[PDB]
């Protein structure tokens, strides 16, 4: 059965961005997804999406720009100590200059660099660059 909503959505967008598609409809609306989009949006990687409320699991329409090479997921949700954060971000990213690993925490949903400022380890969700 459908286990991971986010896991289906993020593939759908990467198969859009490869084709240069302009706006994308995603069928199951989750709160975690919503937090994820708002994280990338405040930092400027995409435009203004809008969510279609049905007294139900909503839908979401993303107006896509063209700056996103990939937006990936890590299943299963691994715990991540501050020891392993460097090895993860090394092996999981293009470079030491750019690209991000987004992990939700007790503190809240935020980037790994913000986790470095706040002194907060946690559970890896995914990444993008």
């Amino acid at each position: 059965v459908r286990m991971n909503v986010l896991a289906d959505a993020l593939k759908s967008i990467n198969n859009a961005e490869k084709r240069g598609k302009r706006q994308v409809l995603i069928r199951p609306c989750s709160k975690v997804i919503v937090r994820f989009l708002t994280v990338m949006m405040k930092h400027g990687y995409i435009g203004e999406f809008e969510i279609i409320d049905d007294h139900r699991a909503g839908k979401i329409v993303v107006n896509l720009t063209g700056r996103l090479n990939k937006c990936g997921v890590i299943s299963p949700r691994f715990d991540v100590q501050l020891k392993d954060l460097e090895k993860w971000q090394n092996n999981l990213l293009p470079s030491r200059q750019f690209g991000f690993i987004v992990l939700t925490t007790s503190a809240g949903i935020m980037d790994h660099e913000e986790a470095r400022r706040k002194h907060t380890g946690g559970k890896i969700l995914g990444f993008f660059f």
Partner: protein, 83 residues
Amino acid sequence: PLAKDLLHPSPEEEKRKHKKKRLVQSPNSYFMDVKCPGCYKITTVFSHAQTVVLCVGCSTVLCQPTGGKARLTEGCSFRRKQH
């Protein structure tokens, strides 16, 4: 076309999609005010009745069920009510 207003599809479109696949889920069934010329009162038939809807006072029959929409008896008017 690349650009496609997914938020703003036309009514002709939302009619020519699948029952779930419209931008929002909506049914294709309806209720209707069925009436013979003789009897006074009007019945409130569901379009997919799966029932023999007898008239008021057991005067005479109107529907005989089929696959989809019910076929009405010879000479029986109706009016699709709305809300």
